[PDB]
Write a protein that binds this DNA or RNA. Sequence first.
DNA 1: GACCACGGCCACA
DNA 2: AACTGTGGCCGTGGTC
Length: 756
Amino acid sequence: MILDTDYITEDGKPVIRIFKKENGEFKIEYDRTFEPYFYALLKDDSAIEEVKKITAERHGTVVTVKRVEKVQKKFLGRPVEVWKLYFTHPQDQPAIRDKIREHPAVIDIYEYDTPFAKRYLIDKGLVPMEGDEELKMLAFAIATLYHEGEEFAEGPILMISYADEEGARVITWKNVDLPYVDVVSTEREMIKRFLRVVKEKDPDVLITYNGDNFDFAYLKKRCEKLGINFALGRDGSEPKIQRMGDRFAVEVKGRIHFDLYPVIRRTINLPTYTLEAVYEAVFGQPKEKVYAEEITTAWETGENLERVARYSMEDAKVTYELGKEFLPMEAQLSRLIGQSLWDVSRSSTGNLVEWFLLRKAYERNELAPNKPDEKELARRRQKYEGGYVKEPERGLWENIVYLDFRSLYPSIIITHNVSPDTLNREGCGEYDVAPQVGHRFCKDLPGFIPSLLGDLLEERQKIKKKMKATIDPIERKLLDYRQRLIKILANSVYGHMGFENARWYCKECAESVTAWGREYLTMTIKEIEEKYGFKVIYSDTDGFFATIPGADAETVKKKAMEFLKYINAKLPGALELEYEGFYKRGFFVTKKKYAVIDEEGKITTRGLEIVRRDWSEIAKETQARVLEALLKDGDVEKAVRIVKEVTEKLSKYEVPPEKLVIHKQITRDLKDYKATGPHVAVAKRLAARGVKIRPGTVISYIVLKGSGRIGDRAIPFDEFDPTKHRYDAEYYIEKQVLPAVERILRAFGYRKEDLR
DNA sequence: GACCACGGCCACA
DNA sequence: AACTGTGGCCGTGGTC
Ligand SMILES: [Mg+2]
Ligand SMILES: [Mg+2]
């Protein structure tokens, strides 16, 4: 199994290293034959002898063009005559590439910014994280003595905790009577203990939580102070820091540094993303938090150090459990993209797509288009139309069905050969025209993108058959992971075509897919209403809720499957409407805001305040109890009782302040904000106090009793004292609880005045 | 000063 | 999952 690849420099020549895991042993493969290269397009092939001799400087060393080679490749379906430029070292490219482009005899250069180690995986056709081998893992966390106002890593690291299959342990340099604590003389010997432990276990994966921005940075500062060779790498190297935009990421050569924070933040939606909140949301168990003000006091006074050691032990223990949950999914995603788990776990969906396309474009001799320049990106700022959004028939409905399409946009791309290499191609025989936009796509040859989506969805169906026959839950869970990720990948390729900074950007291909989706959707809602007498209540892009007015439950499920047979014979090719599920009742408030309940009792809410993080828990809890009384029993009397009970408890200040916290995220620097809302007002006051507010910080404020602007009365929930503070019960009643529940109860004539 | 567009956030698919 | 795109909603300051 391939873990990752990089390259070292031996006598000036590049040597690819392939970190592998075979037969339960860590191996390293060396390759001294791979040569860096990028392509160039010239006005006249005679200029190759002039373009052979451009030189540039690098580290005071003149860079040369090693050799040239003529090749025929496919640039958007069309064969082109492109020249291949070879170089001695990868870093020779960024020094000479701009001078080659500025040569008058050239038109453009292609595939010049591709990293060497990633280029090796693509050209050699190697796929990481492939195989049956099991990886040995180890999570770790640290604890530091924190004082305000001091520099970063000014205080020493007090405890280092690690956890794996054998359990969790804590290394510390003060005596603590606990069975999992290993005591040490000093901090330096505490650190040196951790290196020896990591070296002995020899883990393939090191699991952290926000270790890209803190743990490795803190250990790096201390190791330089105490003169420690932090040789965590399998080759004796030290942790390497890479820049990830406004942040950093840490590498450990030979191993995989799996930071859970970027993986968890994108795979889950929570109000706060503290390690305690993530653990309780995933495993349903409370994890106790001990703040740095408690760590420092307990350490400097030497009192109650077991309570802090238990927090350190649990940190690494829950980090290991979260690691075993999110890594198999991300490992299969790495096998699909064809890149290392380190890069995949920290990359945007767009970059993952361009990695998949670049690997696929290499297998088909397809020259990759370059990233758009500044001026081209300006011409790509035109907005196109999305999917059909029907204004829902407001109110409560009974006995309904939802019928969706099986992968709407990938099916449209496959069926109609939607691709930038097929758009308006002169001289074909079979054309397909898109509605409204009128774009034509040749079909004599399968397009580049429809071939990939066709190959992907074919594999996905093959995986599902292999999945249901698999007996061991392990591969069944992994096959389920792969067949899942394939669906998201195929749908993500469509969005790539509409992205301004995409290599395979095609606005015409994008809007044509949405135009076809609107046609096929509006036709089925028209067929199901005129032929079978259904009533489409709500529709969004690729599905709709419908029923026959005043019909019986089995009669709905009967004629619904009749309509499915009729519409699937009329749908062309890969397009397919399917039966998703039946639900007894369902309330529809507005666009992208509804809630249904099946015959089993499970309620699925969409878009309502229940699923939003910027709403108080008291308002989300009340709206849920109201929906449970209606969707399950239809007892509107129980719902109006619930609301009046909550408001009275709020009016008497008897509701816990924890349920009244509002969580809003900061997205930019506080100077960029042109409108200062409540969560920005409290953040600016905080920054004046000294605390750093970073883009992405989650603010948790509470509104206090008073008058005027809300921002002038909102304090962070850190500073709320029940003996000293009283929240604005008037605000939470009339601006949170009542507005949220009244949108539903207004369907029964109940006004907010009747809800108090 | 009631009325309103509007940043700003997050959600649906 | 969500770069593509479509919407609901609120606290806030601008308006005449
Ligand atoms: Mg290129
Ligand atoms: Mg890398």
